[PDB]
Design a protein around this ligand. Sequence first.
Ligand SMILES: CCCCCCCCO[C@@H]1O[C@H](CO)[C@@H](O)[C@H](O)[C@H]1O
Ligand SMILES: CCCCCCCCO[C@@H]1O[C@H](CO)[C@@H](O)[C@H](O)[C@H]1O
Ligand SMILES: CCCCCCCCO[C@@H]1O[C@H](CO)[C@@H](O)[C@H](O)[C@H]1O
Ligand SMILES: CCCCCCCCO[C@@H]1O[C@H](CO)[C@@H](O)[C@H](O)[C@H]1O
Lengths: 296, 296
Amino acid sequence: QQEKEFLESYPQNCPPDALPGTPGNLDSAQEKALAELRKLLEDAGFIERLDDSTLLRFLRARKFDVQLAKEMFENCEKWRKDYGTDTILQDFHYDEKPLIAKFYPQYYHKTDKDGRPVYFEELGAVNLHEMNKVTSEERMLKNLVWEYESVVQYRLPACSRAAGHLVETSCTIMDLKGISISSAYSVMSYVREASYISQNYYPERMGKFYIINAPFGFSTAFRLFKPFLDPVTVSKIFILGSSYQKELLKQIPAENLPVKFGGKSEVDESKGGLYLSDIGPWRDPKYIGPEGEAPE
Amino acid sequence: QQEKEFLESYPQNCPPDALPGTPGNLDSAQEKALAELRKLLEDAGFIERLDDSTLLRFLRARKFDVQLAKEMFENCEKWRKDYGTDTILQDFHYDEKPLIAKFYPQYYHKTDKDGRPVYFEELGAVNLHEMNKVTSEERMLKNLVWEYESVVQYRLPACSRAAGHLVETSCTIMDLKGISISSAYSVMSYVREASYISQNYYPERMGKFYIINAPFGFSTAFRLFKPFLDPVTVSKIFILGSSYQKELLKQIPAENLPVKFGGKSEVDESKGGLYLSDIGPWRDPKYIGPEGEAPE
Ligand SMILES: CCCCCCCCO[C@@H]1O[C@H](CO)[C@@H](O)[C@H](O)[C@H]1O
Ligand SMILES: CCCCCCCCO[C@@H]1O[C@H](CO)[C@@H](O)[C@H](O)[C@H]1O
Ligand SMILES: CCCCCCCCO[C@@H]1O[C@H](CO)[C@@H](O)[C@H](O)[C@H]1O
Ligand SMILES: CCCCCCCCO[C@@H]1O[C@H](CO)[C@@H](O)[C@H](O)[C@H]1O
């Protein structure tokens, strides 16, 4: 009575108007696709992470090819064992965070109108040189997986309860204000590594993606490739310039969005404002289940 | 005996390994799609431009929806009547060309390895201010349609004969060396207008598209959207930086590519080198048919 107990402690059906193939909306032969991936994995010795939400995201990332879903699934299970992800919430301590946070922000803050936790990344402010004095790329990546594990174990279940429906994804906002060719080159390895970790071991976890303060050449390229990108990806990716407030306020309440991005949400500066904060439904006693409160 | 005489004066079958749906390769039910669009248009009063190559390009631009092909076809026929395209080769004289060519290059020069005429556009060198003294956007657009009409009436048929196979498309090379946000804004209207004229009244005329000397932010965006653009479009579009020679020499011979782009082709400077030139198979007496030599 632990995983089963956890799964039924929060809503498990995505909203009715959600993309097909998502939990509670799968019907078009995909039910049979789901009820096949579970059989193969049960025989292969696997016991955990076989819930509807999990396998469905694996089936969704691989167009519902039950064969490729097993591959992607085993390969991810291989990775969690090697990397020690299963014990990352209690093994790893990013005690350098207060020291380096200002050079590469990274922080979660409340939710958007769909219940998704909002993740902010001020990539344009990054200062790797000043960061390499304290930490290392390896540790920053451990922090990335540590936060991903907080999202699934604590944040998502709490958000589901607060929104009345599932919520398997997050809403991310990346700020490019301040990027240069120089710093862009200095972060490529971390970005390429972080990209590998999520769309392979955390697929379908992205629900919406916003890039604000994107430079002209960059923003222009998107405006020309729009008609050639699949409609499924243009529904999630948003590339906007210096005028982004109206768009953001259209997805995130206003009382939920930080004042710096055109909203009303203010974090007390006498306890690490925004950068060192982690406030949202997951810190509200009435939305915390049998898994207890997430770490800090 | 004029259009019929013209059509059989040059090869009419695309190479065997070409994209399906192209003349001489259409089979998969598309033959019936072709032999339907012609019937509807014959009843609608249309007499010209009903050859396999034409209608097939219209069917290809609209995924083979015979219904939308008729719409796109009539709408283009409407446009040629209004604009006076049918008589553009003899009505319009871009006598300002020698004066303004240096501010917005534009020139055709020989062919690539597939027989396609190569079109060069040094957009990054554009100087609209210096150009507005002499011409106007309206005239530049008339020149664009005048050149398009030389491509189909003279250039393509000559290239077909020289390559031994059809050739319905052109190979374009756009140079961004020298662009600014400023000049990018100063040319948006011409580019937006020119884009409207080709993919609506000259569809499937683009076979390959190369953008060289693309700025970093711009080039980067393409490298991230690559996996999301359809494989049909990534086969035609190439976005490269300052190192483009190897790629170009891989598509265009070397004796065909101008020295400035990393090749061996040199045009005599005592008669308008490149900018004011128009040399290729269409100026070779042995590749000119009953349509005679193209104008200058
Ligand atoms: C200039 C900005 C470049 C940003 C490139 C993406 C860097 C990380 O962005 C992440 O990429 C993941 C891919 O694994 C997605 O699944 C996540 O939703 C996204 O937040
Ligand atoms: C900045 C470039 C775009 C953001 C990174 C790639 C976007 C999505 O990457 C992947 O796309 C899949 C779609 O098949 C989704 O299932 C996953 O959520 C996501 O990991
Ligand atoms: C920064 C460079 C922006 C270039 C945008 C494209 C401008 C013209 O490019 C033309 O566009 C046509 C679309 O109608 C295509 O059919 C042609 O093949 C292409 O040459
Ligand atoms: C710089 C942005 C890309 C170049 C402009 C758009 C590229 C192609 O535009 C159109 O694509 C069609 C494909 O359905 C082809 O049939 C046509 O040749 C082309 O007009």
